[PDB]
Write an enzyme that holds these catalytic residues in place. Structure first.
Site, PDB file in Angstrom:
ATOM      1  N   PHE A   3      -6.268   7.875   0.622  1.00 52.98           N
ATOM      2  CA  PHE A   3      -6.598   6.765  -0.117  1.00 52.98           C
ATOM      3  C   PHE A   3      -7.872   5.939   0.545  1.00 52.98           C
ATOM      4  CE2 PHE A   3      -3.709   5.616   3.106  1.00 52.98           C
ATOM      5  CZ  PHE A   3      -4.066   4.346   3.244  1.00 52.98           C
ATOM      6  N   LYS A  55      -3.344  14.779   8.161  1.00 48.31           N
ATOM      7  CA  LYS A  55      -3.967  13.518   8.560  1.00 48.31           C
ATOM      8  C   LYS A  55      -3.132  12.648   9.536  1.00 48.31           C
ATOM      9  CE  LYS A  55      -5.213   9.121   6.299  1.00 48.31           C
ATOM     10  NZ  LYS A  55      -5.130   8.211   5.292  1.00 48.31           N
ATOM     11  N   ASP A  77      -1.394  -3.375   9.898  1.00 49.21           N
ATOM     12  CA  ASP A  77      -2.540  -3.727   9.420  1.00 49.21           C
ATOM     13  C   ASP A  77      -3.726  -2.732  10.116  1.00 49.21           C
ATOM     14  OD1 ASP A  77      -3.741  -5.944   8.138  1.00 49.21           O
ATOM     15  OD2 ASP A  77      -5.062  -6.511   9.546  1.00 49.21           O
ATOM     16  N   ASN A 129       0.838  -1.378   0.061  1.00 51.78           N
ATOM     17  CA  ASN A 129       0.064   0.125   0.041  1.00 51.78           C
ATOM     18  C   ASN A 129       0.767   1.292  -0.161  1.00 51.78           C
ATOM     19  OD1 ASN A 129      -1.830   2.133   1.007  1.00 51.78           O
ATOM     20  ND2 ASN A 129      -3.239   0.512   1.438  1.00 51.78           N
ATOM     21  N   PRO A 130       1.007   1.868  -1.069  1.00 51.67           N
ATOM     22  CA  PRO A 130       1.729   3.105  -1.312  1.00 51.67           C
ATOM     23  C   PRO A 130       1.304   4.182  -0.372  1.00 51.67           C
ATOM     24  CG  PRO A 130       0.498   2.843  -3.140  1.00 51.67           C
ATOM     25  CD  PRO A 130       0.196   1.753  -2.591  1.00 51.67           C
TER      26      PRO A 130
HETATM   27  O1  LIG Z   1      -1.550  -5.191   3.655  1.00 51.66           O
HETATM   28  P1  LIG Z   1      -0.558  -4.277   3.026  1.00 51.66           P
HETATM   29  O2  LIG Z   1       0.398  -4.770   2.296  1.00 51.66           O
HETATM   30  O3  LIG Z   1      -0.050  -3.355   4.402  1.00 51.66           O
HETATM   31  O4  LIG Z   1      -1.966  -3.523   2.367  1.00 51.66           O
HETATM   32  P2  LIG Z   1      -3.323  -3.271   2.161  1.00 51.66           P
HETATM   33  O5  LIG Z   1      -3.624  -1.804   2.403  1.00 51.66           O
HETATM   34  O6  LIG Z   1      -3.967  -4.206   1.231  1.00 51.66           O
HETATM   35  O7  LIG Z   1      -3.938  -4.095   3.508  1.00 51.66           O
HETATM   36  P3  LIG Z   1      -4.630  -3.562   4.632  1.00 51.66           P
HETATM   37  O8  LIG Z   1      -4.987  -5.136   5.160  1.00 51.66           O
HETATM   38  O9  LIG Z   1      -3.747  -2.930   6.107  1.00 51.66           O
HETATM   39  O10 LIG Z   1      -6.008  -2.922   4.370  1.00 51.66           O
HETATM   40  C1  LIG Z   1      -6.860  -2.429   5.045  1.00 51.66           C
HETATM   41  C2  LIG Z   1      -7.820  -1.508   4.305  1.00 51.66           C
HETATM   42  O11 LIG Z   1      -8.028  -0.531   5.597  1.00 51.66           O
HETATM   43  C3  LIG Z   1      -8.207   0.839   4.731  1.00 51.66           C
HETATM   44  N1  LIG Z   1      -7.396   1.853   5.362  1.00 51.66           N
HETATM   45  C4  LIG Z   1      -6.335   1.800   6.369  1.00 51.66           C
HETATM   46  N2  LIG Z   1      -5.834   2.933   6.767  1.00 51.66           N
HETATM   47  C5  LIG Z   1      -6.622   3.875   5.932  1.00 51.66           C
HETATM   48  C6  LIG Z   1      -6.594   5.199   6.202  1.00 51.66           C
HETATM   49  O12 LIG Z   1      -5.863   5.998   6.656  1.00 51.66           O
HETATM   50  N3  LIG Z   1      -7.711   5.829   4.861  1.00 51.66           N
HETATM   51  C7  LIG Z   1      -8.495   5.169   4.355  1.00 51.66           C
HETATM   52  N4  LIG Z   1      -8.631   3.883   4.266  1.00 51.66           N
HETATM   53  C8  LIG Z   1      -7.604   3.075   5.146  1.00 51.66           C
HETATM   54  C9  LIG Z   1      -7.735   0.747   3.507  1.00 51.66           C
HETATM   55  O13 LIG Z   1      -8.609   0.733   2.204  1.00 51.66           O
HETATM   56  C10 LIG Z   1      -7.047  -0.766   3.227  1.00 51.66           C
HETATM   57  O14 LIG Z   1      -6.945  -1.322   2.118  1.00 51.66           O
HETATM   58 NA    NA Z   2      -1.954  -5.469   6.224  1.00 53.02          NA
END
Ligand SMILES: O=P(O)(O)OP(=O)(O)OP(=O)(O)OC[C@H]1O[C@@H](n2cnc3c(O)ncnc32)[C@H](O)[C@@H]1O
Ligand code: NA
Ligand SMILES: O=P(O)(O)OP(=O)(O)OP(=O)(O)OC[C@H]1O[C@@H](n2cnc3c(O)ncnc32)[C@H](O)[C@@H]1O
Ligand code: NA
Lengths: 185, 185
Positions: free
Chosen positions: B140, B163, B65, B9-10
């Site tokens: 995002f 943020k 996560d 996740n960039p």
């Molecule tokens: O697992 P990694 O590789 O770290 O990437 P990922 O983003 O796919 O995996 P996550 O399981 O941590 O994803 C949780 C989701 O929670 C959301 N999320 C987390 N922090 C956020 C934020 O600050 N603003 C908006 N959405 C957020 C976002 O949609 C993510 O895809």
């Molecule tokens: Na994750």
């Protein structure tokens, strides 16, 4: 023949036991929690599960991963059908489908089987549509709002035998059994 | 100091890098896919992830996560925020919240850190509410429909610095940094 079924879902056990039992195969449920990875395919969850379970449970054993995939929701809830059911539930699905033209969806089951150091997968798919009302007291999960292709009744309005003859699980079980007859006399 | 950040996740990288960089800590993203187990707690996903990753990536490393937990939806989408975002998306969430009295929800971040054979977790939580309209071009994921407690703007209407000063990730990062200063001079 006896086969251990690693699962915490009594609904699956009943259906699996009732189907294979007619052919002289005894299903024993084993409540052994195993890592069910997040993934895009049910097959991937099954592959990782079997690799983790081998050497930790009686053999031969099986596990199963399944879900409801709704076309208008891009496949959701799919692999995460369990969590979605426990959170927004059936009402949440109906809410999301309000005004939906295409109510098409399919249930898919992937059975994983391990014996003599080798893993095998059997899948089954049943298309249908999400009802506008939940009906039926049988089955479990999303059964009250899923009507299989070619039927007027939701899965919840059918018995185990009837559901098995039409469901995704029944189809995976049939492929599984056939494989057993030929490979596993 | 350099720390490897295993993530795909960039968005997370930018936020993490921008925050810790101000204190002389360089964040290097490492796209190394690891098993993210289905679970009820973000902490559990992090624990299993670190155990799987140790010995496979440069050290010290971190993973994260996080998810959006909506009160009226019983915590959904929570741990599976990513999948839900990619399927029903922001419109799906708004659809589910139509007519919802309580639009309260919170974002939670759990950072996992590994060094010298030991794993450490740092968490952060930010409460807020789901908007009725999406607004903003920054951030995002669910940022366009989440307004933190005490603010008029959604996360998508803020810059990275802004943020980070309010978000769940910023809070976890602050706890993480503090730990680094004391333990990791
Ligand atoms: O697992 P990694 O590789 O770290 O990437 P990922 O983003 O796919 O995996 P996550 O399981 O941590 O994803 C949780 C989701 O929670 C959301 N999320 C987390 N922090 C956020 C934020 O600050 N603003 C908006 N959405 C957020 C976002 O949609 C993510 O895809
Ligand atoms: Na994750
Ligand atoms: O993992 P195990 O221990 O086997 O139990 P589980 O039921 O929690 O785990 P699944 O991951 O396979 O759950 C998928 C969900 O798909 C749903 N499901 C599967 N087959 C179904 C069927 O025939 N009728 C209704 N819902 C079904 C049901 O809600 C499940 O909880
Ligand atoms: Na399963």
């Amino acid at each position: 023949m006896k086969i251990f079924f690693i699962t915490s879902n009594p609904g699956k056990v009943r259906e699996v036991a009732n189907f294979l039992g007619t052919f002289g195969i005894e299903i024993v449920q084993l409540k052994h929690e195993y890592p069910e990875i997040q993934a895009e395919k049910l097959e991937d969850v099954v592959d990782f599960g079997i690799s983790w379970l081998k050497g930790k449970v009686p053999e031969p054993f099986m596990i199963e991963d399944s879900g409801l995939f709704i076309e208008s929701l891009k496949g959701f809830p799919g692999v995460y059908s369990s969590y979605v059911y426990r959170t927004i539930g059936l009402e949440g699905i109906l809410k999301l489908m309000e005004g939906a033209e295409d109510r098409r969806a399919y249930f898919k089951s992937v059975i994983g089987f391990y014996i003599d150091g080798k893993a095998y997968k059997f899948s089954g798919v049943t298309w249908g549509r999400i009802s506008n009302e939940k009906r039926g007291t049988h089955g479990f999960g999303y059964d009250p709002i899923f009507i299989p292709e070619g039927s007027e009744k939701t899965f919840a309005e059918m018995t185990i035998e009837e559901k098995n003859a039409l469901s995704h699980r029944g189809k995976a079980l049939k492929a599984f059994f056939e494989w057993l007859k030929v490979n596993l006399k």
